[model samples]
Target chain A: MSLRIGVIGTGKIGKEHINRITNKLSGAEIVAVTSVNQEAAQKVVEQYQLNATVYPNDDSLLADENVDAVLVTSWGPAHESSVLKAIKAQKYVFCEKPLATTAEGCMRIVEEEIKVGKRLVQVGFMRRYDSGYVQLKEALDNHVIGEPLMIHCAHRNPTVGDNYTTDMAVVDTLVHEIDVLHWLVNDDYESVQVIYPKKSKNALPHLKDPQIVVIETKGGIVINAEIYVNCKYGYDIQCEIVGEDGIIKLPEPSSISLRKEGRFSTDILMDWQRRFVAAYDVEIQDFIDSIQKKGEVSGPTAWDGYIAAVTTDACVKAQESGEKEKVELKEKPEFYQ
Target chain B: MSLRIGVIGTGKIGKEHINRITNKLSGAEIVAVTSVNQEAAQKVVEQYQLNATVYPNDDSLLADENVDAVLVTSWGPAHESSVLKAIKAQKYVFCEKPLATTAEGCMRIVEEEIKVGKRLVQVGFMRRYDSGYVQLKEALDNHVIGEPLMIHCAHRNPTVGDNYTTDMAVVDTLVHEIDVLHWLVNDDYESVQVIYPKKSKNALPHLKDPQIVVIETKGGIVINAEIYVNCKYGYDIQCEIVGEDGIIKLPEPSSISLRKEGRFSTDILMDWQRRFVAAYDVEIQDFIDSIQKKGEVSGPTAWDGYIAAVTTDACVKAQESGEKEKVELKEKPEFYQ
Candidate 1:
C-alpha cells in the first residue's frame, strides 16, 4: 500500500520535495500540503495536479485520518510543534534540520521520542544521503583509511548579500558540517575554536567572509572546517578524513573536463541547491521506502539533530568569544546508540 | 653545441643526476666528477660508464675550462664554496637546495650572480617541475581560480625514523614546500606561525610529529601548510590554492583505480623519492636546456634559495618561540626579479 504523506510549509525546499515525492519517488504520495501562505499551497496543489487537499493549517493536516505520515518543512519556530504532533500520533515524521533551534529544545524531542519506545521521527541532514558522503562514511566504517585522526572540510559560496550577517556563517553554513561530520566519524564534538584569517577583499566590508572552525571530537579527532560564504568562488563543499593509514576525500561532483585556450578546467556549481539536489530526493525517497515496514525510521535521528544543534550553538559562541568553546553534549541514550 | 657538466658530489642525488644527464637528457655531457670520497667518485664514473675524468676536489673541477657548467650536489657545507667558485670561473651551476646552509651565505651567491651580470646558479627545488604543482601554477597564472586567498597544503610521510627530531619536521620535511610555494604564489613570506596539533601516539616520544605552519605572504595571501612526517599514511604532498573564484588543487599522482572486495581504492606511494622521481629528471633537463642558449639559466634561482632559507628560519623560530615570527627579507633586487 502507498504511504500517504502530508507536507507542512510549502516553501522553496518544501515545494521541491512535493514535486520530488510526486514525480521522482515511489511508494509515497503527497496527499496533503499546507503553508502559512495558504494560497501559495493551493497554487502548488494545482501546479503539481495532485489529488492532494490543501489544509488550512498544520493542525488540520496532522488530524487527517488519511495522512499516514507527515513531513515538517515549516519554518524554524513551527517545527517543534509540527514534529511533536506527528510523533505523538505514532506516525513517522521527517523534520528538516535544526530539529529544534536550541540544544534544550532538541533534547526535549529526544526525550519525547525515547518516551514513545519506537523511532517515529527522522531529521533531515541530507549530506548523509549524498553518494560521496555515503562513500566516506562506508570508508570510515570499513577502516579503509584506518582510524581517523583529523578532518578538513570547506563550505563556501561565491558571495553573499548585505542581509547575511556574520553569525549566519555558523547557523546558515556550518550547521550542515556539524551534523554530517558527526556521522562520518561516528563521534560528537567536544570543543570548537574559530579563527578568522585575513579577510578577503571580495567580502562585504562588515562581514567576516571566511572563517576557520577548529573542532575536537570526543574520540580525539580534530576537524578544521572553513566556511566562506563570500569566497567569490562557485559553491564548493570539501571534506577530507585524515586517518592513521591514509586520507579519504569526498569525491567532487563529476564533471566533463574541459581543455581550451591553454587551460584545463571544469565547471563548478554556483548554487548549493543544485549541488545537493539529488541527495534531497534520495533522502525523502529513502524515508518513504523504509517506512513501508512497521518499524523505526532509519535515517538521521532525533539524537543526531540534537547533537547538531549543540555544536552549532558552541560554534557561534566560539565565533563571538574568540576562544575554544566547549561543546557539551548530553550522554547519548542507548536508544540512539 | 653540448654543455659540458662537472658533477662535484657522488652522493645519492649526485650519482642519480649524473645518470639522468648522461642517459635520459639531451645536449648535456658529464666531463668531470668528484667527491670528498674520491673512491666513490671513481666508482660512480665507472658505474655510469661516462667518458669522464675523476677529479680530487671541487676546486680543481671548477678550474677545468672544459667544464662549462657544474652540478653542485655535494654536502650542504661544501655548496657555497663549490657554487661560488663555479660562478667565478664563469660556469653555470646547479646547486641542490640551501644554496648555502645559511641565508647570509646564499646572499653571497645572489650578490655574486648579480655582479657577474648574469644568472649563473640554479637551485634544485624540483617541485616547480612536478606536473601537478606545475599545473596548479599555470592555473593560478591564468586566473582560472582567480587570485589566491589561501593555500592549504600537507606534506605527509608514512613514518619517521628514531633520528627524526621535531626540528627536522621543519628543516627536512617542510623545506620543499617553503621553496615551491614561493614560486607558485610568486611571493615571499611576510610572517609565520606554527601550531602543533594533538600529537599522534605513533610519534617518537621526543618528536613533534605534525605541525601546521601559518604563513602570510607579502602579497596578502595566507597559507596553512602541514608537515606530518609520522602520519602513518603514504607519502602525500597536497597543495590546494583557494582563489577568489575557485580552487586549483595539485593533481594527485595518477593511479589505476581498483574495485575489489566491495571497495574503491588506489595505491599511494610509500616512498617520497618515487613520488617525485620524474620531477627530478625534469628539473635537471630543464636546467640543461635553458643553459644551452647561454642567455641565462632558468629554474629556481639563488635568490629563490635565499627566500626559502629566510622563510625556513622564521618557521623554525616560530616552532621554538610559540609566537608569530616576522620574516625579514631583503628588498627584491631588479636583477633577480
Candidate 2:
C-alpha cells in the first residue's frame, strides 16, 4: 500500500520533501509536485524524474486522483483556504505550522475537518516527533525526573526577520515553544507576559528586539520562554524540565566536542531547517502512514492547532496591552477527550 | 599589616580552610580553635599546631585578640548570632550560607553592621567569585546576550530531610538560586510563585518534596528555581542565562565521557560539598586577604544576607498562600549603596 504524495511549494522545504519521498521514505513516492516556478519544479521533476506539473496554484495538485496525501508548503497566508479545499476533496494534509496565522482561520479548518467526521490534517510541530523530545517525555512519564513542575525552554535562530520586533518574537518565532510546552507540560496556559529590553538599534529600531515570554501554566508549572531572533550564531533550541526529584534536559545535538587551544567547544548548527530536517521528513511520513492506515494522524492533532492559535492570539494581545494577558481557549473539546 | 586568624569550626569545611591558608594564601595562620570534642578538634588543632582550648562555646574562640576574624561553620542556625556578635566585637566575619534560619535574623545582623558604620561581615556566596559566574557576569555586562531576559536555575541534593515540606523547598533549599540570580541579574525580586506537582511517594510523605520557585525580577526577567530534596543521585547545580541575542549556560564540570555497551555517559558529582570544595577554600583565602588589608571582604556581604533573607521570606509566603507574593525589603543604607 504505497501512498502517492503530491508536494505543493517547491521551495527549500518542498524540494527537501521530494528528496525524502524519493530517497528516504519506504512507503511513499513523490508522485507529483507543483511549484509556482516551473523551472524549479522541473529541476526536481527532472532530478527525481518525479511526475510533475506547474499548477498556477496548488488546487489542481490537490485534485489529482493519483495523490493520496498533500504536503502544503505554499505561502503562509494562503494556508487556510488551501487546507480547507484539500479536506473537501478528501485528501490528507500535512500543513506547516501557523496552520493559519489567526485562531479564526485555524478554527474554520477545524470545523470543516469535524464536519468530515474524521481527522486528516497534521500540523507540523516536528518537536512532538523529535527523538529527544520523545525520550524526555518518556523519562518524565516514568518519573525519571519525577512529575515536571516547571519548564525552561529557548528557541533561537542564527538570523531571523529583517525587521524583527519584540512582539513578533512570540508570534513568528517562539510559537514552537508555545506549542511544544503546551504539549510537553500537558496543560493549558493561564497567562502569558512578554518582556522587552532596550531596542537593538544595531538591527531594528523603535521596537524592542528579542523578547522573553513568561507563561504560567494551569497545572502550576512556570515556563520561561526566551525567544531570541537575530542571534547571529546558529539555530539552537534547549529545554530543561524541572521536576520533583531530578531534572531532564534535551542535550545539544552536536556532532562532536572539540578541545582546541584551551577552548573546549562544539559547533552549533547554522539552521534548524538542517538540524530538524529529518524530524520534518518523519513528521510528513508519519502523517501519510497514519492517514493511509488509520485515517488520522496523532503527531499533532486539531487540539494542538487550537492551542497554538490561542497562544498566538494571546501573544498579539500581550503586544497590544503591553502587559501580561490571559491565554484562554474554549474548554477542551470532547474530541480531544 | 597581615591579620592573624584562627578556624573555629574544623570539621569538613573547617579543615579545607586550614589547607588553603597554609598552602595557597599569603597572609593568614590557623592560630587557635575551640571544639567541645577537643579530641577531633585537637587532632586538627595540633595538625596546624594552633593554640587549642576545650572551650564550651564560640565566645572563648572569639575572645582571642590574635583571632582578627571568625569563620563560622559549626552549623547553619548558629551562623546568625555568631555573625551578629562578631559584628558587635568589630571583627571581620566570613560564614557559610543561610545566614540564619529566617530572614529576620539575617536582617538583624545586617542592621547591627549598618549601625556600626563599617562593613565588617561577609557571608559566603563563593559562586560570585567562581570563574564561571564571573565570566557570566562579564558576559552580561558586555551585552553578550544583550540584556538578560530570564534565568533558569536549579540546586539539587542527592538527598535531604524526611521532615521537609513545601516551605523548605525554595526557602531553605533553593535560597541559593534566589541569592545568585539576584546577584547575577543585579536586581531585587518583585514577586515569587512556588509551584508543586503531584507528590512522589518516593519522597518522604511529610516533605513537600520538589518545588519550583518562580521569581519575577525587578528588571522583568522571569526565573524558575527548581529545588529537589530527595533526588538520591548527586548534588547538581545548573544555570542558564537567556539574553536578548544569546544564551550562556554553566557547563557541567566533569572529567568522564565514555561511550560503550549502548551507554553514552558523563560524570555527576554526588555532593556539592565535594564538588565546590575548591570554591569554598578560595573564599576563605580571600577572607583572610581582605582582613589583612583591613578592607571589607568582597565576597557575599551583609547586603547579600539581607537580600537572601527578604527573598526567601517572599518565597515561603508564595508556597503557603499558593499565590505569588511580592518581595519587600527595608531601605538600603549608604554603605551598601
Candidate 3:
C-alpha cells in the first residue's frame, strides 16, 4: 500500500512538502493537513488538489484514523507539544528543527520517546542528506584527510524578515550546522563560546548581527560556526574539514553558470527553499521509505532534536553571559543503542 | 630619475618582466641583462630596446654600475647567490621564489641584508599582489570571520615536469601559499605536517602526484593546503578563510562567463603564464616603482623569502619523517619590524 501521510501544518514549508509528495514524488499520499486559517488550508488543498481534509485545528488531523505518519512544519514554539501528541497517537513523525524552543521541552519529548522504546521520530537536519555535505563527511571518514584536526562552517542567509531576531539566527538558521556537524564527526560538544564583533549596519538592530560560535568537541575536534543572518548575498553555506592527510570542502550548489562580458559568475540561491529544495524532498521521501522498508529512519532522530535544543540553549547562554559556556549533555540513551 | 633596472635571467618569465619594465610600466628602464645563452641575451636587448651585454653569467649584471636594480628569474639554484650579490651592491633586487633551496641559505641572505642595514630585497611572492588574495586578507583583518579559525587552500597544476620530485611539491608549489598566508594572517607557523597519499598511476615515475600540508600558526590558526600536481584539470588555485564572524571566499579569477544548455561553466586557465601573468606584471612593476622612489615595496620582502624557506623546510621534514613536525623559525629581523 502507498504509505499514507498527514501533514500537520499548512504553512509555507508545509505546503511545499505537500506539493512535493503529491506532484513531485511517487509512493506517498497526503491524507490530511491542519492550519489555523481556514482560507490558507483550503487554498493549499485546492492548489495541489490533495486528496486530504483541512482540519479546523491541528488536533483533529493529528488524531485522524487514516494517517499512518505525520510531518510537522508548523510554528516553532508550537512544535514540541504538537509533535508529542502525534507520537502518543503511535504515528511516525518528522519534525522540522528547533523541535522545541527550550532544552527542557525537547528533553521532555525525548523522555517520552524513550518510554515508547522504538525510534519513530525524525527531526529535519537536512544537511546530512545534502550531497555536498555527504561527500565531505565521507571524505573525512575515509581519511581523505588523514585525521580531522578542525572544521570551519558558516550559515548565512542573503537577508531575513524584519521579525527575525538575534536569537533566531542561532536558533533557527545556525542550528542546522549545530545538529548535523556533531553527527558528521560523531563528537559531542564540550564547550560553547560566542564572539560578537562590530555589526554590519546592514543588520537589523542590536541583533548582535552576524555572530561566531566556537565549539570544542569531546574528542578534541574543533569546529567554528559563523552565522550571518543579514548577509545580502544568497543563502551561502560553507564548510572546510582539516585533517592530517588532506582537506575536502562542501562545493557550493549553484548549477546556473553565466558567461557575461569578461565576468564569469554563477547564480546564487537566496533562500533555503531554493538552496536545499532537493534535500528536503529527499529527506521526506526517505522518511516515508524508511517506514515502509526499515520500519524506522536512520536520520535525525529524537536525540538529534534534543542535542540541537541543548546546543541552542548553550549558545544563548554564552551570548547572554559573555563567556565561554560549558555544555554537558547526558549520556546517550539506551534506546539509541 | 627613472630606476635603471637589469634583467639577469632572460628566460620566459624574465623576458616578460623585462618587457613590462620597458613597455608597460612607467618610470623604469631595462639597462642591462646577463644571459648564459649569449645569442638569446643580445636578442632580448634588441627586441626590448635594452642596453644589454651578453655576459657569460649573472655576476656582472649584479655588479654593473649602470644597473640600479636586478630581477632574478633564473633556474632555481642560482637564486640565493645572486640575491646576496645585489645586497652587497646595495641595489634593490626582485627574486622569484625558492630564494635558495634551503632555509639556512635564506637565513644567510636575510642575515646579510640586516648587516647591510636596509630592506633592499623583495621576494616575488606575487599572490599577495593579486586582488582576490588581498580581499581575503582584508576579510580576516576586518574580523569578517571572528578570528580566522582555519584556512583551506588548494594549488593544483595540470601536470608536473619529469624533472620534478616529491620535495619540489612543497618547495615549488606550496611555498606560494606559505608566503602568501603568512603575510595574510601576519603570524608565523608553529607546526607542519605533510601527507603523501597513494600515487596516481598516470604520474611520471619521478613525480609525486599530490601532497597535502597542514600548517598550524603561532596563534593556533590552522591552514590546510592541498597541492595536486598531477590533476588533469586546468591550473586551479582556491583559497577560503574561515573566520569567527563571517567567511570571505577567494572568487575564481575569470574574465569571461559563459552558460549553455543547463550546464553553466567558465573556461579554465590552461597554464600559469596566462593564469598569473597579471599578478606577475603588477608585482614586478611595484618592485621597479619602489626602487625608483627609494621606497619600501608593497610586495613580499627578503623576510618573506626567509619565512617561506623555513616553512618549506618543515614541510620537507614532515614528508620524510611521515609524522607531524614542529617548525622553529628564528626571530624576525629588525628589517620587517
Candidate 4:
C-alpha cells in the first residue's frame, strides 16, 4: 500500500511539495492538508484537484490516523510545534528547513526523537539530493580530489521581501551553505564571521543585501560564501572544492549556451523553484521510500538541522559584532551519531 | 610600414610564433631569423617561404639594424643573454616566458630595462591575454564579485615527456597559475606549500603526476591549485574567485555539451595549443602593436617575470621540504611599481 501523507501549510512552497508528491512521485499519496488560512488550504485542494481532505488546523491533520506520514511546510515559526505534534502521533515526518526557527527548538526535536528511540524525522536539505552535489560527494569519497583543503560557494537571489533583515542574510539565505557545506566536507563548523561589502544600489536601504560568511571547520578547512539577495541578477549558485591533490566543481545546471551579439551566456534561473525542482522531487520520493522500507527517516536527520540552526546563530552574532563567533553546538549524542 | 621582427630559436614554439606573425598577425613582418640549430632555422624559413635573412646566431639577429624588434624563443638557459643583447641594441623585445630561468637572471633583466628607462620587454604569460582570464579580471576590477577572498585553480595535462620530474609539476605546470592568479587578485604570493597525493598509476615511476600547491597572498587571500600532468583525461584549466559579496568564475572555454548513452559531457581539449592558440595570437599581436605605436611593450612586464621566478623558487623549496616555505622576493623597485 502507498504511504499516506498529510501536508501542513498551503503556501507557495507547500503547494509545490503537494504537486510533487501527487504527480511527480510514487509510493505516496496525499490524504490530508492544513494551513493557517483555511481558505488557502481549501483553495489548493480545489486548484490542484487534490483527492485529499481539508483540515482546520495542523493539529487536526496530525490526529488523522489515516495519514501515514507528515510533511511540515508551515511558516518558519510554526514548524517546531507541528513537527512535535506529528512525533506525538508516531508518524514519519519531513520538515522543511529550520526544523525550528531556533537551535534550542531543533535540539528539542532531537531530544524527543531520541526519546522515541526511532529516526522518524527528516529535515529538507535538498541540495544533498542534487546530482551536482552528489557527484562532488562521490568524488571526495573516492579520493579523486584527495583531502579537501577549502571550498568557495556563491548564493545569489534577484531580490527579497521588504521585511528581510540583516539577520535573514544568515538565517534564511546562507542557511543552505551552512548545512550543505558541512555535508559536503563531512565536518562541523568551528567558527563563523560575517563581512559586509558596499551595498548594491538596488538593495533596500536597511538591507545589507550582499555579504560574505567565512566559516572555519573543526578540521581546519576554510569555506567562504557570498550571499547576495538583491544582486539584481537571477538566482545563481556555485561551488568549487579545493583539495590536496585535485579539484572538483559543480557544473552549472544544464542550459544551452547561446553565442549572440558578440557575447556568450546562458539564461540564469529567476527563482530557486526552477533551479531545485528536481531535487525536491528526489528528496521527497526518497523520504517516502525510506519510510516504506525501513519505517524510518534516511535523509538529513534532526541532528543536522540542529547544527545548522546553531551555526546560523553564530553567523548572526558575527554579523552584529563584526567579529568571528564560535559555534556553540551541544555535543553530538550517540543516538544521532 | 610594418615593424621589422627578428625571430630567435626556431624550435617548435619558435616556428609556431613565426607562422603566427607571418600569417595570423598584421602589424609585424619577419626580417631575420636565428637558432642554435642553423639547419632547422633554414628549413623553417624555406617551409614557410619567408622572405627573411638567416642569422647564424641570436647575437647577429639582435645586431641587425633592419630589425625593429626581437623575439627570444630560445632555450630557457639562453634567454638572459639574448634578452640582454636585445636591450643593449635598444630594440623592443617580446620574450617567451622564463625571460630568464633563475630569479637573479630575471632581476638582471629588470635592472637593465629600468636603466633603459623604457618598457621594451613583454613576457609571454599568454593566459593574461586569454578572453576567459581577461573576463575574470574585469569582473574583479569592476567589483562584480566584491573583494576576492580566495581562489581555486586547476591545471591538468593528459601526459608529460619522459624526462619530466616532480619539480616540473610546480615549476612547469603550476607556473601558469602562479602568474595568472596574482594578476586576477592583484596580489603577490606571501607563502607556498606543496602537498603530494598518491601518484597516478599512469604516471612515470620517477614523477609524481598529480599534486596540489596552496598559496597565501599578502592581502590574506588563499589560493590552491591542482597540477596534474599524467591525468590521462585531457587538458583542463579552471579558476573560481571567491569574494566578499559575490563570485566571478572562468567558464570552461566554449564546447558543446552532448548527452548520449545516459551521460552528459563536453569534449576535453587534448592539448593546450588548441585551448590557448587564440591567446598566443593576441599576446604576440598586442606586443607588435605596442612596439609599432609607442616603441615599448604593453603586456606582462619584466617585473612579472621576475616575480614568477621568485615564486616558483619558493614552490620548489616547499616541494622538497614537504613544508610551507616563505617566498623571498626583493622589494619592488619604483620603476616597475
Predicted candidate 1 versus true structure: per-residue lDDT over A76-158, tens digit per residue: 87898888878777788999976888888898888889989988888988889999998998889998877777888999898
Model 4 C-alpha lDDT per residue in residues A1-337, reported as the tens digit of each score: 9999999988988998888888888998888999989899999999888889999998788888799999899898999998888887888999998799888899888888888899999999999999999999999989886677667688888788899898988888788888888898888888876656545655789887578677878876777677878765578888988665556889888889999999798888889778887888899999999999988888899999999999988998999997679997788889876
lDDT of prediction 4: 0.84
Per-residue alpha-carbon lDDT of candidate 4 for residues B115-205, written as tens digits (9 for 90 to 100): 9999988999999999999999888889886677667677878788899999988777788898898888888788887766545666789
Pairs clashing within candidate 3: A146-A245, A259-B257, A259-B258, A262-B255, B145-B243, B145-B244, B145-B245, B146-B244, B146-B245
Q: Please, what is the whole-model Cα lDDT of each candidate in the order they appear?
A: 0.86, 0.75, 0.78, 0.84
**lDDT, residue A103, model 4:** 87
Q: Deviation in angstroms for B186 in model 1?
A: 1.4
- Per-residue lDDT, model 3, residue B37, is 86
lDDT of 4 at B260: 98
Please give the distance, in angstroms, between residue B318's alpha carbon in candidate 1 and its true position after superposition: 4.4
Candidate 3 chain B weakest ten by summed lDDT:
B193-202
The candidate scoring highest on DockQ is 1
What's the lDDT for residue A158 in model 1?
Answer: 83
Could you tell me the TM-score of candidate 2?
A: 0.82
